[PDB]
Design a protein around this ligand. Structure first.
Ligand SMILES: COc1ccc([C@@H](Oc2ccc3c(cnn3-c3ccc(F)cc3)c2)[C@H](C)NC(=O)C2CC2)cn1
Lengths: 247, 13
């Protein structure tokens, strides 16, 4: 069995939001429902990461560290893919019972956050990204940041990261293009991977603010609350080494 | 510190 097929088989199931369509829409209602759903997406992300070949061999501390950094990169990219497979859109397919449409985008403060998510699905569409390439890219996003001093199992991590970089390369060759275009596609796809760092930084600005401002009454589940509580001090003390393909 | 995440990684799925 191929390494890419092993990443395919562990693709998490589609979760429903539990959004009652009969009651009218509001930004607060939608944002609250999405945070609660986000916690359930992140609980499934732990199960997902554990089944990625090589991940369970890293020190337990490194496993926690990687999921804590990458949480938003994983969710924005997976949503971007899900929304791109239901395109031409212009829509964010958060769950089958909760799709952010053009009318939902008009709601106060909705667009300002949605636009960073819409950039991801627009890029996968523009570059006509395949399933195999996507699977390789999502695993590479779990391994896109490390602490300032590095990981406990850094050597093993660098070995695992190189392995999945090579896996991405195999999915590019399959598109049957000449080596000049093969270099072009890799440059293009790894540029989107690098640009995820900015998408996340933009999404986390409004997310950290809604979490810290208790007067906004915007609830986060225990799983999301725990990640944000851990991440805020690390971004504050500069304890993050964002890995870049292009300099 | 990060009780829920450590539990989810340590437990058998
Ligand atoms: C209004 O726009 C947003 C944008 C992002 C979020 C939250 O982040 C996500 C990201 C992705 C999420 C979910 C749930 N589900 N999926 C998903 C769905 C499908 C898939 F394939 C992958 C993930 C939650 C975030 C924690 N909270 C904030 O940013 C709050 C300040 C607003 C909520 N509302």
């Amino acid at each position: 069995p191929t390494l890419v097929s092993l990443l395919e088989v562990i693709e998490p199931e589609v979760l429903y939001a539990g959004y009652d369509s009969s009651v009218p829409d509001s930004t607060w209602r939608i944002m609250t429902t999405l945070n609660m759903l986000g916690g359930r997406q992140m609980i499934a992300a732990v199960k997902w990461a554990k089944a990625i070949p090589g991940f369970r061999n890293l020190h337990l501390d490194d496993q926690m560290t990687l999921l804590q950094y990458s949480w938003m990169s994983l969710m924005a990219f997976a949503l971007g893919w899900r929304s791109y497979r239901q395109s031409s859109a212009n829509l964010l397919c958060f769950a089958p019972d909760l799709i952010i449409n053009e009318q939902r985008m008009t709601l106060p403060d909705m667009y300002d956050q949605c636009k960073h998510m819409l950039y991801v699905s627009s890029e996968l569409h523009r570059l006509q990204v395949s399933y195999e390439e996507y699977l390789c890219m999502k695993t590479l996003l779990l391994l896109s940041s490390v602490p300032k001093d590095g990981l406990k199992s850094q050597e093993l991590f660098d070995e695992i990261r190189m392995t999945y970089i090579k896996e991405l390369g195999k999915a590019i060759v399959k598109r049957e293009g000449n080596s000049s275009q093969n270099w072009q596609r890799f440059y293009q796809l790894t540029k989107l991977l690098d640009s995820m760092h900015e998408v996340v930084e933009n999404l986390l600005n409004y997310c950290f603010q809604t979490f810290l401002d208790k007067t906004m009454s915007i609830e986060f589940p225990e799983m999301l609350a725990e990640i944000i509580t851990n991440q805020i001090p690390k971004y504050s003390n500069g304890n993050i080494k964002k890995l870049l393909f292009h300099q | 510190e990060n009780a829920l995440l450590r539990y989810l990684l340590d437990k058998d799925d």
